[PDB]
Every structure is written in structure tokens, then in C-alpha cells.
Design a protein around this ligand. Structure first.
Ligand SMILES: CC(C)(C)[C@@H]1NC(=O)O[C@@H]2CCC[C@H]2OC/C=C/C(F)(F)c2nc3ccccc3nc2O[C@@H]2C[C@@H](C(=O)N[C@]3(C(=O)NS(=O)(=O)C4(C)CC4)C[C@H]3C(F)F)N(C2)C1=O
Ligand SMILES: [Zn+2]
Length: 158
């Protein structure tokens, strides 16, 4: 009934999060580990110090947030306005993405949806290594991902 940290992706470190049935990612920004509601629901983040309740819960935007667990360093928000981004997956892959709006980004090369499955909550990074967005959904046709939908980093504030 809680979310557990089961690993990380070393870039800054993205957290690999798991429930009893699902696994996804968590990205710390502004002292808050953000993730997606469709993975974590309203569940707490567990750990040796005891369960911690979510401090942010938005079902409409599919965005949730816990206070960053001790040791989870926050990534730097992107302020350079880059349009060439990089999606970090749970498998440490770094998929180039061309931003085509506030919440959308086109893939330079279509990827099978299976390779992006489980990477919701991962960051989209700019050429400087700063987080410009948070992976939420994929634009899928014939089982192939041609674009992604993400929560803009501007929405990841206190
Ligand atoms: C066809 C498709 C690809 C399955 C689907 N595309 C899709 O919907 O595209 C349209 C067009 C562009 C945006 C989107 O508009 C609808 C908005 C969807 C949403 F995201 F805002 C969302 N809000 C919710 C809020 C509350 C409760 C449930 C919600 N459920 C949602 O959507 C659901 C979930 C989301 C998802 O699967 N995300 C990913 C992922 O990895 N998850 S996961 O870790 O394996 C796992 C399931 C363990 C947690 C990255 C994408 C993929 F790479 F795996 N979905 C379905 C999709 O992406
Ligand atoms: Zn930047």
C-alpha cells in the first residue's frame, strides 16, 4: 500500500519507484520527488524512517510529489529554453526529443512503446543536464511511440 525506492538511474540520480504491481520513475526538483499519479496514486513513500505522505496530489495533471527523501538530491530546473531535449528512461537510455509545444516533444526516431514503458516520472533533460519536463504519456500509433507528453518543469514548484 506504499511506494518503495528500488533503484536509481545515474545521470544527479533519478529514482526508480515501485508499488506491488507497477514500477516507474521519480525525479527530484526543488526539494520534491515528483512522479505520476497513474503509478503511485495517493500512496505514501516508504523507507526506514517510516512512511511519508504526499505533499502534492493532482489527479487531473497526473502529478504527485513527496518531500525529497533524505539523500535524494534535486535536479536543476532548465532555464535556457532549449528545444532539443533528452528523455531518460528506467534503463538509463537517453532518447533525443524535439520540443513541439509546452507539453509535447517529438521523437527523432520512433521507439517501441515497450522501451518507454515504466519510465513515467523520468526527466526530460536539456543539453546542459537540467530538467525541462517530466515524462507523463506517449503519443502511440501502431504500438510505436512518435512523441511524448510531459509536465513542464515550471509546474514542479513548491
Ligand atoms: C497509449 C499510452 C501510451 C498507454 C498512453 N498515451 C496517451 O494517453 O497519450 C495521450 C496523448 C498525449 C497525452 C495523452 O493524453 C491522455 C493523458 C494521459 C495521462 F498520462 F495524463 C494520464 N493521467 C492519469 C491521471 C490519473 C489517473 C490515471 C491517469 N492515466 C494517464 O495515462 C495513462 C498512463 C500513461 C502512460 O502509460 N505513461 C507512460 C509510462 O511509462 N507509464 S508506466 O511507468 O509504465 C505505468 C503504467 C506504471 C505507471 C510514459 C508512457 C509510455 F511510454 F509507457 N498513458 C496512459 C499513456 O501514455
Ligand atoms: Zn536548459
Amino acid at each position: 500500500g506504499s511506494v518503495v525506492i528500488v533503484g536509481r538511474v545515474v545521470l544527479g540520480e533519478v529514482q526508480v519507484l515501485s508499488t506491488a504491481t507497477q514500477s516507474f520513475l521519480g525525479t527530484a526538483v526543488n526539494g520534491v520527488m515528483w512522479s505520476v499519479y497513474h503509478g503511485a496514486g495517493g500512496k505514501t513513500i516508504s523507507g526506514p524512517k517510516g512512511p511519508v505522505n504526499q505533499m502534492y496530489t493532482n489527479v487531473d495533471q497526473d502529478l504527485v510529489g513527496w518531500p525529497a527523501p533524505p539523500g535524494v538530491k534535486s535536479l536543476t530546473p532548465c532555464t535556457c529554453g532549449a528545444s532539443d531535449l533528452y528523455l531518460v528512461t528506467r534503463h538509463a537510455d537517453v532518447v533525443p526529443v524535439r520540443r513541439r509545444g509546452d507539453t509535447r516533444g517529438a521523437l527523432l526516431s520512433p521507439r517501441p512503446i515497450s522501451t518507454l514503458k515504466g519510465s513515467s516520472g523520468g526527466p526530460l533533460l536539456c543539453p546542459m543536464g537540467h530538467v525541462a519536463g517530466l515524462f507523463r504519456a506517449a503519443v502511440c500509433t501502431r504500438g510505436v511511440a512518435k512523441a511524448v507528453d510531459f509536465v513542464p518543469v515550471e509546474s514542479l514548484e513548491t
